[PDB]
Coordinates of C-alpha atoms and ligand atoms in Angstrom, one line a residue:
Chain D
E1 CA -17.1 4.0 1.7
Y2 CA -18.5 3.8 -1.5
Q3 CA -21.5 4.0 -3.9
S4 CA -22.4 1.5 -6.1
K5 CA -23.7 2.7 -9.9
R6 CA -25.3 2.1 -12.7
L7 CA -24.9 3.8 -16.2
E8 CA -26.6 2.8 -19.5
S9 CA -24.4 2.9 -22.8
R10 CA -26.1 4.1 -25.7
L11 CA -22.3 4.0 -27.0
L12 CA -21.3 0.6 -26.0
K13 CA -24.7 -0.7 -26.1
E14 CA -25.1 -2.4 -22.6
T15 CA -25.5 -0.8 -18.7
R16 CA -21.9 -0.3 -17.2
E17 CA -21.1 -0.1 -13.6
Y18 CA -19.0 2.0 -11.4
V19 CA -18.1 2.4 -7.8
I20 CA -17.6 5.9 -6.7
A21 CA -15.7 6.7 -3.3
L22 CA -15.8 10.7 -2.1
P23 CA -13.4 12.2 0.0
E24 CA -13.6 12.4 3.7
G25 CA -15.1 16.0 4.4
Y26 CA -16.7 16.1 0.9
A27 CA -20.2 16.6 2.3
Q28 CA -19.1 19.7 4.0
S29 CA -17.9 22.0 2.1
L30 CA -18.2 23.2 -1.8
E31 CA -14.7 22.3 -2.3
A32 CA -14.4 20.7 -5.9
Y33 CA -12.1 18.0 -6.1
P34 CA -10.1 15.6 -9.0
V35 CA -10.9 12.8 -9.7
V36 CA -8.7 9.6 -10.0
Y37 CA -10.7 7.2 -12.2
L38 CA -9.5 3.5 -11.8
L39 CA -9.5 0.8 -14.4
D40 CA -10.5 -3.0 -13.4
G41 CA -12.5 -2.0 -11.1
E42 CA -13.6 -5.5 -9.7
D43 CA -10.0 -6.7 -9.7
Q44 CA -8.2 -3.2 -8.3
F45 CA -10.4 -1.1 -6.6
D46 CA -10.6 -2.7 -3.2
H47 CA -6.6 -2.0 -2.5
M48 CA -6.3 0.9 -4.5
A49 CA -8.7 3.1 -3.1
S50 CA -7.7 2.0 0.4
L51 CA -4.5 3.5 -0.3
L52 CA -5.3 6.5 -2.0
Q53 CA -7.9 7.1 1.3
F54 CA -5.0 6.3 3.2
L55 CA -2.4 8.9 1.4
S56 CA -4.8 11.8 1.8
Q57 CA -5.8 11.7 5.6
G58 CA -4.4 12.9 8.3
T59 CA -2.5 16.2 9.2
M60 CA 0.1 16.0 6.7
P61 CA -1.7 14.7 4.0
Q62 CA 0.4 13.2 1.4
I63 CA -1.7 13.8 -1.6
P64 CA -4.7 15.5 -1.9
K65 CA -8.6 14.8 -1.5
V66 CA -9.7 13.6 -4.8
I67 CA -13.3 11.6 -5.7
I68 CA -12.1 8.1 -6.8
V69 CA -14.1 6.6 -10.0
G70 CA -13.8 2.4 -10.6
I71 CA -15.0 1.1 -13.8
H72 CA -16.8 -2.4 -14.1
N73 CA -15.5 -4.4 -16.8
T74 CA -18.2 -6.6 -19.0
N75 CA -15.9 -7.1 -22.2
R76 CA -12.1 -6.4 -21.1
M77 CA -10.7 -7.6 -24.1
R78 CA -13.2 -5.1 -26.2
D79 CA -13.1 -2.6 -24.3
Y80 CA -9.6 -2.7 -23.3
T81 CA -7.4 -3.7 -26.4
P82 CA -6.9 -0.4 -28.8
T83 CA -6.4 -2.8 -32.0
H84 CA -7.4 -5.8 -33.5
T85 CA -6.0 -9.1 -33.3
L86 CA -6.6 -12.9 -32.6
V87 CA -2.6 -14.1 -32.6
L88 CA -0.2 -13.4 -28.9
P89 CA 2.9 -12.1 -30.3
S90 CA 4.7 -15.8 -30.9
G91 CA 2.1 -15.7 -34.3
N92 CA -0.4 -18.6 -32.2
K93 CA -3.8 -18.0 -31.3
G94 CA -4.7 -15.9 -28.5
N95 CA -7.9 -17.0 -26.2
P96 CA -11.4 -17.1 -28.2
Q97 CA -12.0 -13.4 -26.2
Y98 CA -9.4 -11.8 -29.0
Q99 CA -12.4 -11.9 -31.1
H100 CA -13.9 -9.2 -29.7
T101 CA -10.5 -6.9 -29.4
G102 CA -9.8 -3.3 -30.9
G103 CA -12.6 -1.3 -29.2
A104 CA -10.7 0.8 -26.4
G105 CA -11.6 3.5 -28.3
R106 CA -14.8 2.7 -28.4
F107 CA -14.5 2.0 -24.6
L108 CA -12.9 5.7 -24.1
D109 CA -16.0 7.8 -25.6
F110 CA -18.0 6.0 -23.2
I111 CA -15.6 7.5 -20.7
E112 CA -15.8 10.6 -21.9
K113 CA -19.0 11.8 -23.2
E114 CA -21.1 9.1 -21.0
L115 CA -19.2 9.0 -18.0
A116 CA -17.5 11.6 -16.9
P117 CA -20.3 14.2 -17.4
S118 CA -22.4 12.0 -15.5
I119 CA -19.8 11.8 -12.6
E120 CA -19.2 15.7 -13.4
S121 CA -23.2 16.2 -13.1
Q122 CA -23.2 14.9 -9.9
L123 CA -20.7 15.7 -7.8
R124 CA -17.9 19.1 -7.1
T125 CA -14.6 18.4 -9.7
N126 CA -12.1 20.5 -10.6
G127 CA -11.0 19.2 -14.3
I128 CA -8.2 17.7 -12.8
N129 CA -8.6 13.6 -14.0
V130 CA -6.1 10.9 -13.5
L131 CA -6.6 7.3 -15.1
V132 CA -5.1 4.9 -13.6
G133 CA -5.0 1.2 -15.7
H134 CA -2.6 -1.8 -15.4
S135 CA -1.9 -4.7 -17.5
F136 CA -4.4 -4.3 -20.7
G137 CA -5.6 -1.2 -18.7
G138 CA -2.4 0.6 -19.0
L139 CA -3.0 0.1 -22.9
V140 CA -6.1 2.0 -22.4
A141 CA -4.1 4.4 -20.5
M142 CA -1.4 4.7 -23.7
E143 CA -4.8 4.5 -26.0
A144 CA -6.2 8.0 -24.3
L145 CA -2.7 9.6 -24.4
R146 CA -2.1 8.2 -28.0
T147 CA -5.3 10.0 -28.9
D148 CA -4.9 13.0 -27.3
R149 CA -8.3 12.5 -25.6
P150 CA -8.9 15.8 -23.2
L151 CA -10.3 15.0 -20.0
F152 CA -7.4 13.6 -18.3
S153 CA -4.1 15.4 -17.3
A154 CA -2.3 12.4 -15.8
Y155 CA -2.1 8.7 -16.4
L156 CA -0.7 6.5 -14.4
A157 CA 0.4 2.9 -17.1
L158 CA 1.1 0.4 -14.5
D159 CA 3.1 -2.8 -16.1
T160 CA 1.6 -1.7 -19.4
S161 CA 0.6 -5.1 -22.1
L162 CA 2.5 -3.3 -24.6
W163 CA 3.3 -6.8 -26.5
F164 CA -0.3 -7.2 -27.6
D165 CA -0.6 -6.9 -30.9
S166 CA 3.1 -5.9 -31.0
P167 CA 5.1 -4.4 -33.2
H168 CA 2.3 -3.0 -34.7
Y169 CA 0.5 -1.2 -32.0
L170 CA 3.7 -0.4 -30.1
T171 CA 4.5 1.5 -33.4
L172 CA 2.0 3.5 -33.6
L173 CA 2.7 4.5 -29.6
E174 CA 6.0 5.6 -31.2
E175 CA 4.7 7.4 -33.9
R176 CA 2.5 9.5 -31.5
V177 CA 5.7 10.3 -29.0
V178 CA 8.0 10.8 -32.4
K179 CA 5.4 13.7 -33.4
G180 CA 5.3 14.9 -29.6
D181 CA 3.5 18.2 -28.9
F182 CA 1.3 17.1 -26.0
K183 CA -0.9 19.5 -24.3
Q184 CA 0.1 19.6 -20.7
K185 CA -0.4 16.1 -20.5
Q186 CA 2.1 13.7 -17.7
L187 CA 2.4 10.0 -17.7
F188 CA 3.6 7.7 -15.2
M189 CA 5.0 4.0 -16.5
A190 CA 5.4 1.4 -13.3
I191 CA 7.5 -1.8 -14.7
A192 CA 7.8 -4.6 -13.3
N193 CA 10.1 -7.8 -13.5
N194 CA 7.5 -10.6 -14.8
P195 CA 9.0 -13.7 -15.2
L196 CA 6.6 -14.9 -18.0
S197 CA 5.3 -12.8 -20.8
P198 CA 1.8 -14.1 -22.7
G199 CA 2.7 -16.4 -25.6
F200 CA 6.3 -16.7 -24.9
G201 CA 6.3 -18.5 -21.5
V202 CA 9.2 -17.9 -19.3
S203 CA 10.6 -14.4 -21.1
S204 CA 11.5 -10.7 -20.6
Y205 CA 10.0 -9.8 -23.7
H206 CA 7.0 -7.9 -21.9
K207 CA 9.5 -6.0 -19.7
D208 CA 11.5 -5.4 -21.9
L209 CA 9.3 -3.4 -24.6
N210 CA 8.2 -1.3 -21.2
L211 CA 11.5 -1.0 -20.4
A212 CA 13.1 0.0 -24.3
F213 CA 9.8 2.3 -24.7
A214 CA 10.2 4.2 -21.3
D215 CA 13.9 4.9 -22.4
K216 CA 13.3 6.0 -25.7
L217 CA 10.2 8.3 -24.4
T218 CA 13.3 9.9 -21.8
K219 CA 15.9 9.9 -25.0
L220 CA 13.0 12.1 -27.0
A221 CA 11.4 14.4 -23.9
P222 CA 8.6 15.4 -26.3
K223 CA 6.9 18.6 -25.9
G224 CA 4.2 18.8 -23.2
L225 CA 4.4 15.7 -21.6
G226 CA 6.0 15.2 -17.7
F227 CA 7.6 12.3 -17.8
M228 CA 8.9 9.5 -14.8
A229 CA 9.6 5.8 -15.2
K230 CA 10.4 3.6 -12.6
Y231 CA 11.1 -0.3 -12.8
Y232 CA 10.6 -2.3 -9.5
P233 CA 12.9 -5.5 -10.1
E234 CA 11.4 -7.7 -7.2
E235 CA 7.7 -7.0 -8.0
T236 CA 5.8 -9.1 -10.4
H237 CA 2.9 -8.0 -13.1
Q238 CA 0.2 -8.4 -10.8
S239 CA 1.9 -6.9 -7.7
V240 CA 3.2 -3.7 -9.0
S241 CA -0.5 -2.6 -9.3
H242 CA -0.3 -1.7 -5.4
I243 CA 3.7 -0.4 -5.1
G244 CA 3.5 1.2 -8.8
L245 CA -0.1 3.2 -7.7
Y246 CA 2.0 4.5 -4.7
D247 CA 4.7 6.2 -6.1
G248 CA 3.0 7.4 -8.8
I249 CA 0.4 9.0 -7.4
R250 CA 2.8 9.8 -4.6
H251 CA 5.1 11.7 -7.1
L252 CA 2.1 13.2 -9.6
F253 CA 1.2 15.1 -6.5
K254 CA 4.5 15.6 -4.6
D255 CA 4.5 19.5 -5.2
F256 CA 0.7 20.2 -3.8
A257 CA 2.6 19.9 -0.5
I258 CA 2.7 23.4 1.8
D259 CA 5.6 23.1 3.9
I260 CA 5.1 25.9 6.7
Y261 CA 8.8 25.6 7.4
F262 CA 7.9 29.6 3.0
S263 CA 5.6 33.0 2.4
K264 CA 2.4 34.0 0.6
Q265 CA 3.7 34.4 -2.8
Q266 CA 5.9 31.4 -2.2
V267 CA 2.6 29.3 -2.2
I268 CA 1.2 31.2 -5.4
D269 CA 4.0 31.0 -7.7
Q270 CA 3.8 26.9 -6.9
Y271 CA 0.6 26.7 -7.7
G272 CA 1.1 29.0 -10.6
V273 CA 3.5 25.5 -11.8
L274 CA 1.4 23.2 -11.1
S275 CA -1.5 25.1 -13.0
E276 CA 1.1 25.9 -16.1
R277 CA 1.5 21.6 -15.9
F278 CA -1.4 20.4 -15.5
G279 CA -2.6 22.5 -18.4
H280 CA -5.9 23.5 -16.1
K281 CA -6.3 26.0 -12.9
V282 CA -4.7 24.6 -9.7
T283 CA -5.9 26.2 -6.2
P284 CA -4.6 24.7 -2.9
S285 CA -7.3 22.6 -1.7
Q286 CA -9.6 24.5 1.1
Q287 CA -9.7 21.4 3.6
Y288 CA -6.1 21.6 3.3
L289 CA -5.4 25.2 4.2
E290 CA -7.6 25.6 7.2
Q291 CA -5.7 22.6 8.7
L292 CA -2.4 24.4 7.7
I293 CA -4.2 27.1 10.3
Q294 CA -5.2 25.3 12.6
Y295 CA -1.6 23.5 13.2
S296 CA -0.7 27.5 13.6
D297 CA -3.6 29.0 15.1
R298 CA -3.2 26.0 17.3
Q299 CA 0.5 25.6 17.7
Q300 CA 0.2 29.8 18.0
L301 CA 3.0 29.6 14.9
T302 CA 4.2 33.1 13.7
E303 CA 2.8 35.0 11.0
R304 CA 2.5 31.8 9.5
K305 CA -0.9 31.7 10.8
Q306 CA -2.0 34.9 8.9
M307 CA -0.3 34.2 5.5
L308 CA -2.0 31.1 5.4
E309 CA -5.3 32.9 6.1
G310 CA -4.6 35.4 3.5
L311 CA -3.9 32.6 1.1
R312 CA -6.8 31.3 2.2
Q313 CA -8.0 35.0 0.8
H314 CA -6.4 34.7 -2.2
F315 CA -7.8 31.2 -3.6
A316 CA -11.1 32.2 -2.1
Chain I
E1 CA -14.1 -9.4 4.2
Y2 CA -13.3 -10.1 8.0
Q3 CA -15.5 -11.6 10.9
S4 CA -16.2 -8.7 13.8
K5 CA -15.3 -10.6 17.2
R6 CA -16.0 -10.0 21.0
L7 CA -14.2 -11.0 24.0
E8 CA -15.0 -10.5 28.0
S9 CA -11.3 -9.6 29.5
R10 CA -11.2 -10.8 32.7
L11 CA -8.0 -9.7 32.7
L12 CA -8.6 -5.7 31.7
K13 CA -12.3 -6.5 33.6
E14 CA -13.9 -4.9 29.9
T15 CA -15.5 -6.0 26.4
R16 CA -12.7 -6.5 24.3
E17 CA -13.2 -6.0 20.6
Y18 CA -11.5 -7.4 17.4
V19 CA -11.5 -8.0 13.9
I20 CA -10.8 -11.2 12.2
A21 CA -9.6 -11.4 7.9
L22 CA -9.2 -15.5 6.8
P23 CA -6.9 -16.1 4.0
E24 CA -8.9 -17.1 0.9
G25 CA -8.6 -20.9 0.4
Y26 CA -8.9 -21.3 4.0
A27 CA -11.8 -23.3 3.9
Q28 CA -11.3 -25.7 1.3
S29 CA -8.2 -27.9 2.9
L30 CA -6.5 -28.5 6.6
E31 CA -3.7 -26.0 6.1
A32 CA -2.8 -24.6 9.0
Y33 CA -1.9 -20.7 9.1
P34 CA 0.7 -17.5 10.5
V35 CA -1.1 -15.3 12.6
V36 CA -0.6 -11.5 12.0
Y37 CA -2.0 -8.9 14.6
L38 CA -2.4 -5.6 13.8
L39 CA -2.6 -3.3 16.9
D40 CA -4.8 0.0 16.9
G41 CA -7.3 -1.7 14.7
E42 CA -9.8 0.6 14.5
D43 CA -7.9 3.0 12.6
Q44 CA -5.3 0.8 10.8
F45 CA -7.0 -2.5 10.2
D46 CA -8.6 -1.4 7.0
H47 CA -5.2 -0.6 4.6
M48 CA -3.1 -2.8 6.4
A49 CA -5.5 -5.8 5.8
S50 CA -5.7 -5.0 2.2
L51 CA -2.5 -5.1 1.5
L52 CA -1.6 -7.9 3.3
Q53 CA -4.7 -10.1 1.4
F54 CA -3.3 -8.3 -2.0
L55 CA 0.8 -9.2 -1.2
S56 CA -0.4 -12.9 -0.9
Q57 CA -2.9 -13.5 -3.9
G58 CA -2.0 -14.7 -7.4
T59 CA 0.0 -17.1 -8.8
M60 CA 3.2 -15.3 -7.7
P61 CA 2.6 -14.4 -4.2
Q62 CA 4.5 -12.3 -2.5
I63 CA 3.9 -13.1 1.1
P64 CA 2.5 -16.1 2.1
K65 CA -1.7 -16.9 3.2
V66 CA -2.1 -15.4 7.2
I67 CA -4.9 -14.7 9.2
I68 CA -5.2 -11.3 9.9
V69 CA -6.3 -10.5 13.7
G70 CA -6.9 -6.1 14.0
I71 CA -7.2 -5.6 17.7
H72 CA -9.4 -2.4 18.8
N73 CA -8.9 0.0 21.1
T74 CA -10.6 0.8 24.4
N75 CA -7.9 3.2 26.6
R76 CA -4.5 3.6 24.5
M77 CA -2.1 5.3 26.9
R78 CA -3.6 2.4 28.9
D79 CA -3.0 -0.1 26.6
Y80 CA 0.0 1.0 24.8
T81 CA 2.4 2.1 27.8
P82 CA 4.8 -0.1 29.2
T83 CA 6.1 3.0 31.8
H84 CA 3.7 5.2 33.6
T85 CA 4.6 9.0 33.2
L86 CA 2.5 11.7 33.6
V87 CA 4.8 14.4 31.9
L88 CA 5.6 14.6 28.2
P89 CA 10.0 14.5 27.5
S90 CA 9.9 18.0 28.1
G91 CA 8.8 18.0 31.7
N92 CA 5.0 19.5 30.4
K93 CA 1.9 18.1 31.5
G94 CA 0.7 15.4 29.5
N95 CA -2.9 15.2 28.3
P96 CA -5.6 14.0 31.5
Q97 CA -5.4 10.6 29.7
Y98 CA -1.2 10.0 30.8
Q99 CA -2.9 9.3 34.7
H100 CA -3.4 5.3 33.4
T101 CA -0.2 5.0 32.0
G102 CA 1.7 1.9 32.9
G103 CA -0.5 -1.4 31.3
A104 CA 1.6 -2.4 28.3
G105 CA 1.9 -5.4 30.8
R106 CA -1.3 -5.9 31.2
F107 CA -2.5 -5.6 27.7
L108 CA 0.3 -8.2 26.3
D109 CA -1.0 -10.6 29.0
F110 CA -4.6 -9.8 27.8
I111 CA -3.2 -11.1 24.7
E112 CA -1.7 -14.3 25.7
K113 CA -3.8 -15.6 27.9
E114 CA -7.2 -15.0 26.7
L115 CA -7.1 -13.2 23.4
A116 CA -4.4 -15.8 21.6
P117 CA -6.0 -18.8 22.4
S118 CA -9.2 -17.9 21.5
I119 CA -8.2 -17.2 18.1
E120 CA -6.4 -20.8 18.2
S121 CA -8.8 -22.8 19.8
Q122 CA -11.4 -21.2 16.6
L123 CA -8.7 -21.3 14.1
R124 CA -6.2 -23.2 12.2
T125 CA -3.1 -21.6 13.4
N126 CA 0.6 -23.0 12.7
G127 CA 2.8 -21.5 15.4
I128 CA 3.6 -18.4 13.5
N129 CA 3.0 -15.2 15.5
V130 CA 3.6 -12.0 14.2
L131 CA 2.7 -8.1 16.2
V132 CA 2.7 -5.1 14.5
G133 CA 2.7 -2.0 16.0
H134 CA 2.6 1.5 14.7
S135 CA 3.3 4.8 17.1
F136 CA 2.8 4.1 20.5
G137 CA 1.6 0.7 19.3
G138 CA 5.5 -0.6 18.4
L139 CA 6.0 0.2 22.2
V140 CA 3.8 -3.3 23.1
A141 CA 6.0 -4.2 20.5
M142 CA 9.1 -3.4 21.6
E143 CA 7.5 -4.5 25.6
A144 CA 6.8 -8.0 24.2
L145 CA 10.7 -8.5 22.8
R146 CA 12.2 -6.6 26.1
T147 CA 9.8 -8.8 28.1
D148 CA 10.9 -12.5 26.3
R149 CA 6.8 -13.0 25.5
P150 CA 6.8 -16.5 24.1
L151 CA 3.6 -16.1 21.8
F152 CA 5.3 -13.7 19.1
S153 CA 8.0 -14.7 17.1
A154 CA 8.5 -11.6 14.9
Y155 CA 7.7 -7.7 15.7
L156 CA 7.3 -5.2 13.3
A157 CA 7.3 -1.6 15.0
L158 CA 6.6 1.2 13.1
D159 CA 7.5 4.6 13.9
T160 CA 8.1 3.7 17.7
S161 CA 7.4 6.4 19.9
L162 CA 10.4 6.0 22.2
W163 CA 10.0 9.5 23.1
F164 CA 7.4 8.2 25.6
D165 CA 8.5 8.1 29.1
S166 CA 12.2 9.0 27.8
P167 CA 14.9 8.9 28.6
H168 CA 13.8 6.0 31.8
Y169 CA 12.1 4.0 29.1
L170 CA 14.4 3.9 26.3
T171 CA 16.8 2.9 28.7
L172 CA 15.0 -0.4 30.0
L173 CA 15.2 -1.3 26.2
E174 CA 18.9 -0.3 25.7
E175 CA 19.5 -2.7 28.7
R176 CA 17.8 -5.6 27.3
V177 CA 19.9 -5.6 23.7
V178 CA 23.2 -5.6 25.6
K179 CA 21.8 -8.4 27.9
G180 CA 21.0 -10.1 24.0
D181 CA 20.7 -13.7 23.3
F182 CA 16.8 -14.0 22.3
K183 CA 15.6 -16.7 21.4
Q184 CA 15.6 -16.8 17.8
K185 CA 13.2 -13.4 17.1
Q186 CA 13.1 -10.9 14.8
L187 CA 12.4 -7.1 15.0
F188 CA 11.9 -4.8 11.6
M189 CA 12.3 -1.0 12.6
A190 CA 10.4 1.5 9.7
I191 CA 11.8 4.8 10.7
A192 CA 10.4 8.0 9.1
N193 CA 10.9 11.9 9.1
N194 CA 7.9 13.9 11.3
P195 CA 9.1 17.0 11.8
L196 CA 7.5 17.2 14.8
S197 CA 7.9 15.3 18.6
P198 CA 5.1 15.7 20.8
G199 CA 6.0 18.0 23.8
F200 CA 9.0 19.8 21.5
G201 CA 6.3 21.2 18.5
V202 CA 9.0 21.6 15.6
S203 CA 11.9 18.9 16.5
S204 CA 13.0 15.4 15.3
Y205 CA 13.9 14.1 19.0
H206 CA 11.4 11.4 18.1
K207 CA 13.4 10.6 14.7
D208 CA 17.0 10.8 16.4
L209 CA 15.6 8.2 19.6
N210 CA 14.6 5.8 16.4
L211 CA 17.4 6.1 14.5
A212 CA 19.8 5.9 17.4
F213 CA 18.5 2.8 18.6
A214 CA 18.7 1.2 15.3
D215 CA 22.3 2.0 15.0
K216 CA 22.9 0.1 18.6
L217 CA 21.0 -2.5 18.0
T218 CA 23.1 -3.0 14.8
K219 CA 26.6 -2.4 16.4
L220 CA 25.2 -4.1 19.0
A221 CA 23.9 -7.4 16.9
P222 CA 22.4 -9.0 20.3
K223 CA 22.9 -13.0 19.4
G224 CA 19.6 -14.4 18.7
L225 CA 18.4 -11.9 16.8
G226 CA 17.4 -10.8 13.3
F227 CA 16.9 -7.0 12.5
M228 CA 16.5 -4.3 10.0
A229 CA 15.7 -1.2 9.9
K230 CA 14.5 1.2 6.7
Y231 CA 14.7 5.1 7.1
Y232 CA 11.8 6.9 5.0
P233 CA 12.8 10.3 4.5
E234 CA 10.1 10.8 2.5
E235 CA 7.0 9.3 5.3
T236 CA 5.7 11.2 8.1
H237 CA 4.8 10.1 11.5
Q238 CA 1.6 8.3 10.3
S239 CA 1.7 7.4 6.5
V240 CA 4.5 5.4 7.2
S241 CA 2.6 2.7 8.9
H242 CA 1.6 1.7 5.0
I243 CA 5.2 1.7 3.0
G244 CA 6.8 0.0 6.8
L245 CA 4.2 -3.2 6.6
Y246 CA 5.0 -3.2 3.0
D247 CA 8.5 -3.2 3.4
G248 CA 8.5 -4.8 7.4
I249 CA 6.2 -7.8 5.8
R250 CA 8.1 -8.6 2.4
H251 CA 11.6 -8.2 4.2
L252 CA 10.0 -11.0 7.2
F253 CA 9.1 -13.8 4.4
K254 CA 11.6 -12.6 1.5
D255 CA 12.8 -16.0 2.1
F256 CA 10.0 -18.3 1.8
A257 CA 9.5 -18.2 -1.9
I258 CA 10.3 -21.5 -4.0
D259 CA 11.4 -20.5 -7.6
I260 CA 10.8 -23.7 -9.8
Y261 CA 13.4 -22.1 -12.5
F262 CA 16.0 -26.3 -7.7
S263 CA 15.5 -29.7 -6.1
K264 CA 13.7 -31.4 -3.3
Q265 CA 16.9 -30.9 -0.4
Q266 CA 17.1 -27.3 -1.7
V267 CA 13.6 -27.1 -0.4
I268 CA 13.9 -29.1 2.9
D269 CA 16.9 -26.9 3.6
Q270 CA 15.3 -23.9 2.8
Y271 CA 12.8 -24.7 5.3
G272 CA 15.4 -25.7 7.7
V273 CA 17.0 -22.2 7.8
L274 CA 13.5 -20.6 8.1
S275 CA 12.6 -23.0 11.1
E276 CA 16.0 -22.2 13.2
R277 CA 15.3 -18.8 12.4
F278 CA 11.8 -18.5 13.7
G279 CA 13.2 -20.7 15.8
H280 CA 9.7 -23.3 15.3
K281 CA 9.0 -25.7 12.2
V282 CA 8.1 -23.9 9.2
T283 CA 7.2 -25.7 6.7
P284 CA 5.7 -24.8 2.6
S285 CA 2.5 -23.9 2.6
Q286 CA 0.4 -26.4 1.0
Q287 CA -1.7 -23.9 -0.6
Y288 CA 1.5 -22.7 -2.1
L289 CA 2.9 -25.5 -3.3
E290 CA -0.3 -27.2 -5.2
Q291 CA -0.3 -23.7 -6.8
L292 CA 3.4 -24.2 -8.0
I293 CA 2.2 -28.1 -9.3
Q294 CA -0.4 -27.3 -11.3
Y295 CA 1.7 -24.8 -13.2
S296 CA 4.2 -26.8 -13.6
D297 CA 1.7 -29.7 -14.5
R298 CA 0.1 -26.7 -17.2
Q299 CA 3.0 -26.3 -18.0
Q300 CA 4.9 -29.6 -19.0
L301 CA 7.8 -29.0 -16.9
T302 CA 10.1 -31.4 -16.6
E303 CA 10.3 -33.8 -13.3
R304 CA 9.5 -30.3 -11.5
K305 CA 6.3 -31.4 -10.6
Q306 CA 7.6 -34.8 -9.7
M307 CA 10.2 -32.7 -7.8
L308 CA 7.2 -30.9 -6.5
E309 CA 5.0 -33.6 -5.7
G310 CA 7.6 -35.3 -4.0
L311 CA 8.6 -32.5 -1.9
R312 CA 4.5 -32.1 -0.8
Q313 CA 4.6 -35.4 0.3
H314 CA 7.5 -35.2 1.9
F315 CA 5.5 -31.9 4.3
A316 CA 2.0 -34.9 4.8
Ligands
LIG1 CL1 -1.9 15.9 -26.6
LIG2 CL1 13.8 -13.9 24.0

């Protein structure tokens, strides 16, 4: 269940369409939620949104409730590439739409100055914003991190097209990593085993770039960046967007869970750690605490019911 | 994008609702597809159907195209329970809808005698039918296998509620396993790590029933049954429906992929093995072959195009 919306971009000089999925229970309180921005909305929103909602529903949600925003494309080669090139890594000319490359900076300015402000004005957001980009969308994610964009706390880069304008762009990326000292950011990379690489046909060049880059991040361990990568040998470039999101989003929010099987102070301290990791206050979801109190209340479960009440009162 | 359907069940003496998702390209050829029947359609169809369609789209599909049938419930405790009992495993009374338990036989009859014939008279189906049951729906899968229902060749049992009417029902299942000699059947079990077991509270009783039955199937190795189980320690009883189908359906269709990087006969033999495994004729998807020939055709690929075209003719 989504809303279909439009925004006139004065920056990009065109109409921009997007889709919003509100979390179940949204209308029933003043709870503010995180926002997961999804690139390639037209292609990826349906399967990604349905997964995100499945993971957050039930009595034992695996991730918290989130607002989902799917961003639709107009000129993808312009908006998703951070640098300009007319050629593939082979030196051979890319398709005619390569003439438009190099506008990721401007597209990001649309997200931060036009889209996000509009979203945050319309809905109750909690200051935690996630960006999910697959393929070229991954370069938007890498470029947001590279340019120290303040909006996003966490990035999921699913089989990023790092081969694009390589070695030039990749070199800029590496140099940001070496400089390090990130503003409490998080990065997750899903790496697939695609047998092809654009410009080369049957080759592992695309894959090898991702694996080498992930290895360098791990080896350099820049300060202020939570990083994790997963290699999927049985996935392809396109098929990895679903499982990559699965594992990346579950990883991102794994420590938000409160296992009722434990004390009030343990929960406060755990959310303190999450607040410092995200670089923004993070408090347990009001809905989530109400369920726990219901699972306790309904099941006569210990002082736990009462620990959960005070804990609800703490963050009130 | 589904089709909302209705069938007057003479057997069940009620109106039965269901949803159909046709594979992409359906209207474009005379190709016949397998049918994946999903139980608990009201709650599970949306995320399962989006995953299934996602896994079979693109130039390197992970599973073949299928017809997805989601079956909605009316009286779930009546239709999803193979035996009748008014009590939980603890001996305490179940909720008042326990009085209707034991109708899984008739609900399966509904599928074979009314629903499947109706689907098959309306759509181009290829003889390969798969049943996906989660929780209590997992018990329907078990009973279909237990009572040798001829319609289905493969079953996905996702965190089966084996605790229901235990130890009685479970013993009936075990008796069937020992008797073995299945008629080229397939069973996949997903086993989650839920901290609760109905009627027991915090208890691994439900999980233990699953793990021990899987161990029994593995050790006993009944003739004529391809079996595999996967345990998910980071999943709950409800959350495992998704990743359980993900891995289950991928495992079922794993050997259907043709890597053209190989001979006409290698695929003939490959499909001979699949046919013997499903106990029914299995042939490469017409769309899939056409995808392979056009890639080959595009990439000036040897007489691989010719080999594939050779394959194309053999199965015509
Ligand atoms: Cl930063
Ligand atoms: Cl049999």
